[PDB]
């Protein structure tokens, strides 16, 4: 028995019931499954992951990564969410505050005095 999943683009995907059970959002749904929050491009990647290294699977551009985080969370796939979130953490590791800002296109919202307050707080922990 094989179950059908619908993306936001309209397109449909046929998957094994073992594969779709990996999403706890899908498992809760009791013709076929509409997923208005997941595009075809991203749903294909989810399905590919749900076939049961993944270091290769994570060799994607930044936009796709964050869309995959949103999908993994909208569906309830703990392992994919963990992998995608660990990958973002690895991007943060080893970067200066400016390099972090540049990578994720973050605006510095700190006052000069707030910045020094954070710095002074950080001093209370060994590195």
């Amino acid at each position: 028995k094989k179950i059908v999943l619908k993306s936001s683009d309209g397109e449909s995907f046929e998957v094994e019931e073992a594969v779709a059970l990996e999403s706890q959002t899908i498992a809760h749904m009791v013709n076929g499954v509409p997923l208005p929050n997941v595009t075809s491009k991203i749903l294909a990647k989810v399905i590919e992951y749900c076939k049961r290294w993944d270091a290769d699977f994570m060799k994607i551009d930044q936009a796709t990564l964050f869309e995959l985080i949103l999908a993994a969370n909208y569906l309830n796939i703990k392992n994919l969410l963990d992998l995608t979130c660990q990958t973002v953490a690895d991007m943060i590791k080893g970067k200066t505050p400016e390099e972090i800002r540049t990578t994720f296109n973050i605006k510095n919202d700190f006052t000069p005095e707030e910045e020094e307050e954070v710095r002074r707080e950080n001093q209370w922990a060994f590195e």
Partner: protein
Amino acid sequence: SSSAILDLPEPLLLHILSFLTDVRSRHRAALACGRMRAAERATRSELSLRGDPRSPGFLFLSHAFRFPALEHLDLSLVSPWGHPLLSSVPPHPEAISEQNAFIAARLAGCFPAVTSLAVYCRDPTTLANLTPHWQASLRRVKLVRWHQRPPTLPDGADLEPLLETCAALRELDLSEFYCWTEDVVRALTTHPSATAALTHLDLGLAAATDGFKSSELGPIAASCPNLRKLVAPCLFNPRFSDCVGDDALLSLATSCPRLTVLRLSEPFEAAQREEAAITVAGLVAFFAALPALEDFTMDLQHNVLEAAPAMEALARRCPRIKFLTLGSFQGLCKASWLHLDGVAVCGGLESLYMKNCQDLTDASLAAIGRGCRRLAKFGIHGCDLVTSAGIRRLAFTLRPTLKEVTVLHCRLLHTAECLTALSPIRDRIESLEINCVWNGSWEMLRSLSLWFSAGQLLSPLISAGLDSCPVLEEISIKVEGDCRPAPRTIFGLSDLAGFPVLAKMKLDLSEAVMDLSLWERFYLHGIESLQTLYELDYWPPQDKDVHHRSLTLPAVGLIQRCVGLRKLFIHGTTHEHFMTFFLSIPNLRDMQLREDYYPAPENDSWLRFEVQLNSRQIDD
């Protein structure tokens, strides 16, 4: 246009930050923006407190310095290092009590959810002042004391505040806590309500004890029916009638039937051929009584002869046995018969360390390679019959799994031949520990531990086989012997300059022995040529007479030029006048004098240097 990471639902940003474990990175993330500061503070799981929590700087930090999810709080490294923290003992009784209550309340403010605590603990009133805020959640406590036990305390008084108030306590780590064996026995036998629930016990006592006797271990075990992990030093010398023999081991097993980790060791002086009171039949009965055992260490100086049938019993009776360390067990694997024997029968072994097995041969290693097909870690220490042919065969057989090798003080295994014999796993070995004896990359080698005799040079290591180590990130160097060399001869630290990612060094001269100045110069010379050196732990040598271990001026001059240092820990002391020289290291952040050896000097200026260190504009 906008930031995708900041457009994520805040719970997902928190989830991301929960995977960042490098502290400096967490700090940098908190500096990126307001939203990441909040996420970092909300997800930090552990913290080692830096500075003086008694100061206004700590006590009047804002509401924003708050770590709601923090589980592990380490207080053992607060400044000044090793001083009494929140003690009631006078160094006005109501002024002390009030200031202690405030500091404790502020610690609970910053760290509400603590389940695991490490604390430097000079006397028990420290514990009485810290526990009341976390007594509901405190599961694990680690105590540190390298100083003398206060002479006037009653037996067991060090542990009483923990045992009276902390109902959630499960794990007690006294590995680095100097007290008497009597203290442990008295506390742990007279607090049945606390003690019945304990699952983990480390009884190392700062390695400053002759070991627990039979009359001490018996009652401790009897009072701890729920133990899963026991680490203890024991008296195994059969010349004392209270030593640990067959009966004591069996009592241990039947009193603690749920043990999965059991590490017992014999403390020794340099000032060994006699047999232990432990027999093969005794061990057979012992293993039968421990069916859940996974991790077993028995590291003796006294011999257990013809040990093979006990290892066969271990395999049968403890089917989950994975990690095995044995010292002075003889005949562990003879390889004399058609069938595999002794330790070669233990098919589930993932690590094996054998010390002072005088009849272990190349044939033994060949057998071990075939029998123990899951071996990821292998060590031999003082096994004098093993040759490079045996190592080569072992490394070849265990090529699919073998990642960590230790070869120490094996007479027929000099360094050049030993490194050559490891050629079958040269591209796969992640960690290597060897002592150096003098006459195509190490692709995965991340970690290297070296042992030297006093005056011996490091330089020949490169041509002996370790010339290309592209991922080597940490090196540990320990020097043994009596110092009491041509003037341009140096140890040769600068010959490590060819290692491109070497970031972390332990240089331990504590047992290497004015004259000490020239030795420090000999060892430290060229340290500035290590361009990626980031973290240095340096243990100065002892002088036979004096209580302090001094970092002399030549050593200061040498370390000062290590431009890349972020972290510098000196396991000893230095003159106040030498301190400012370290400030010229441009990005140095963490620096501390840690006198973490027994007995620690009772100290009678660091705090002012510490403000000077924090005031510089170093990189984030």
